[PDB]
């Protein structure tokens, strides 16, 4: 498995500002042989399949069920909040070597089910934040979904 990461959402149309708040990851896969992991979360703002912004949170050295509660801000127009998708990706850090991909979640157009409901709930609450548990899925499949 990959695990599950909880993150919040908060759109402000009055100003046209998108907000993504990282909360915590759990059941994260072990990337270190017989050891722990160093998973962190990242956020990417894509336009119906077009990379626009890239963000990353702190790194929880040696762990698999760490907390974050980080607040990120984006600049998405009230007319784009529906055409954009916030992708929450969790990657494992490895000092020198490259960072392994634990998994990644996505919310927005291409999204569906609990993911689409969250993004929609966000727009429904253009003032109050929306937190929910997002189960990290295979990044490759995730990228395949965004691809039309
Ligand atoms: Ca590793
Ligand atoms: Ca590691």
Curated annotation (Swiss-Prot):
- For Ca(2+) 5, which residues are the binding ones? 32, 92, 94, 100
Compartment(s) of residence: Cytoplasmic vesicle, Secretory vesicle membrane; Cytoplasmic vesicle, Secretory vesicle, Synaptic vesicle membrane; Cytoplasmic vesicle, Secretory vesicle, Chromaffin granule membrane; Cytoplasm
**Domain spans labelled C2:** 1-134
State start and end of the fragment within the whole protein.
272 to 419 of 421
**Record's function text:** Calcium sensor that participates in triggering neurotransmitter release at the synapse. May have a regulatory role in the membrane interactions during trafficking of synaptic vesicles at the active zone of the synapse. It binds acidic phospholipids with a specificity that requires the presence of both an acidic head group and a diacyl backbone. A Ca(2+)-dependent interaction between synaptotagmin and putative receptors for activated protein kinase C has also been reported. It can bind to at least three additional proteins in a Ca(2+)-independent manner; these are neurexins, syntaxin and AP2.
Q: Which residues take part in binding Ca(2+) 4?
A: 32, 38, 92, 94
State the name under which the record lists this protein: Synaptotagmin-1
Tell me how this protein assembles.
Homotetramer. Heterodimer; heterodimerizes with SYT2 in presence of calcium. Interacts with SCAMP5. Interacts with STON2. Forms a complex with SV2B, syntaxin 1 and SNAP25. Interacts with SV2A, SV2B and SV2C. Interacts with RIMS1. Interacts with PRRT2. Interacts with DNAJC5 in a phosphorylation-dependent manner. Interacts (via N-terminus) with RAB3A. Interacts with SYT12. Interacts with calmodulin. Interacts with DNM1 (via C-terminal proline-rich domain (PRD)); this interaction facilitates vesicle fission during clathrin-mediated endocytosis (CME).
* Family label: Belongs to the synaptotagmin family.
Q: What is known of its domains?
A: The first C2 domain mediates Ca(2+)-dependent phospholipid binding.
Q: What is the effect of changing residue 94 to E?
A: Fails to relocalize to nerve terminals after stimulation of neurotransmitter release
Sequence positions bearing Phosphoserine: 71, 73
